[PDB]
Design a protein around this ligand. Structure first.
Ligand SMILES: OCCN(CCO)CCO
Ligand SMILES: [Cl-]
Ligand SMILES: [Cl-]
Ligand SMILES: [K+]
Ligand SMILES: [Mg+2]
Ligand code: NA
Ligand code: NA
Length: 369
């Protein structure tokens, strides 16, 4: 669609860091049988666990399709709000609004990016995203929060900010011809400065190995822990295709400076021992000719970097790895000493459909007064 006549930055807005205070978290509800095994029941139960864990820290709203509303309302505790919303799949980091705030009429707004199911008619993950195109408008209308609209295609999982002017992104995703092939790097930067209130960029060339379907979203590779400090997906195994990506990202990060002129300190957050979809898993997924196939043997895009920050809580995946799960809890607990770190077992169930906890959440900042 078209772009708002004035940008967020013209009105004083910017995207705050994820660790700033939230009013609530938004989460979708999975259902489609060609992405979620066994009629989505195992994933529904893990989404409900993620939502419940977040609800201990802050309010949660789960949005569920007309067909699923009663099921979601049964599976969620009563203090989680459940609302009806049509969607083509349940990845609200990507299809939901990117909220923005200001200091100095409302002091919160949301950005409704364009969307094409991570690469459109050619290269997208499913063939119909027309419900997804309305999710951001519907969420913002629910909350009576003003909306800015962009014509640019963007997913929230592809951008990360420190709240101090820096934006961390991947070239693999935002420069892919399947997103905005009419725009240069410089033009994409200009739009992100105007809409996120950022001044400078850190461009990692590639995202996580195994995340070809999003084209290497930043949120599954590297994120800020606080200004000047990032967590980076890591392996020491030179035989894993991940290694060359991690080493290249570390080299870029060690030659980067943030928008306020700090060097970037990197904390390595080790990926689990490689995970692969099993035949039993793949056999529970339909092939209706509407979505990409989910095949036995696929390397899962599993990284503990795909955690979510809530008010006083870190909600982190657990993948069953007998050392990396506990290492991730420890590293995150040390890196966020004022937060409680909660692990979600069976996060694998989300990773079978190509993302994890961070991909299924969208924070609504508290509105500054
Ligand atoms: O399958 C649609 C959603 N999926 C895309 C990558 O497989 C994970 C969310 O980014
Ligand atoms: Cl609207
Ligand atoms: Cl826990
Ligand atoms: K894709
Ligand atoms: Mg949108
Ligand atoms: Na219930
Ligand atoms: Na195999």
């Amino acid at each position: 669609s078209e772009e708002s006549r004035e940008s967020p930055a013209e009105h004083g807005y910017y995207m705050p860091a994820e660790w700033d205070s939230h009013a609530q978290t938004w989460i979708g509800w999975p259902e489609r049988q060609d992405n979620w095994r066994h009629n989505a029941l195992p994933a529904q139960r893990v989404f409900a666990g993620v939502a419940k864990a977040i609800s201990k820290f802050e309010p949660v709203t789960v949005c569920a399709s007309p067909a699923q509303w009663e099921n979601a309302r049964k599976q969620l505790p009563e203090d989680i709000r459940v609302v009806e919303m049509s969607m083509n799949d349940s990845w609200f980091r990507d299809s939901g609004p990117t909220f923005i705030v200001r200091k100095r009429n409302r002091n919160i707004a949301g950005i409704d990016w364009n969307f094409n199911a991570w690469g459109g008619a050619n290269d997208g993950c499913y063939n119909d995203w027309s419900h997804d195109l309305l999710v951001s408008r519907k969420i913002l209308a629910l909350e009576r929060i003003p909306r800015f609209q962009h014509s640019m295609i963007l997913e929230g999982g592809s951008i990360h900010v420190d709240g101090e002017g820096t934006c961390l992104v991947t070239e693999e995703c935002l420069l892919n011809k399947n997103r905005n092939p009419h725009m240069s790097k410089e033009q994409i930067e200009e739009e992100l400065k105007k809409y996120l209130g950022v001044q400078s960029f850190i461009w990692l060339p590639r995202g996580l190995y195994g995340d070809e379907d999003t084209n290497g979203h930043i949120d599954n590779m590297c994120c800020f822990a606080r200004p000047g400090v990032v967590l980076l997906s890591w392996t020491d195994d030179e035989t894993d295709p991940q290694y060359e990506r991690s080493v290249e990202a570390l080299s870029v990060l060690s030659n980067s400076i943030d928008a306020r002129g700090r060097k970037i300190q990197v904390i390595k957050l080790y990926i689990p021992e490689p995970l692969y979809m099993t035949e039993e898993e793949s056999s529970g997924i339909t092939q209706d000719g509407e979505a990409i196939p989910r095949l036995a043997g696929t390397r899962l895009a599993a990284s503990y970097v795909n955690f979510y920050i809530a008010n006083g809580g870190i909600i982190a995946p657990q993948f069953g790895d007998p050392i990396r799960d506990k290492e991730a809890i420890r590293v995150l607990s040390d890196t966020f000493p004022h937060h409680s770190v909660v692990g979600i077992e069976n996060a694998r169930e989300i990773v079978l459909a190509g993302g994890n906890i961070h991909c299924i959440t969208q924070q609504q900042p508290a509105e500054p007064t």
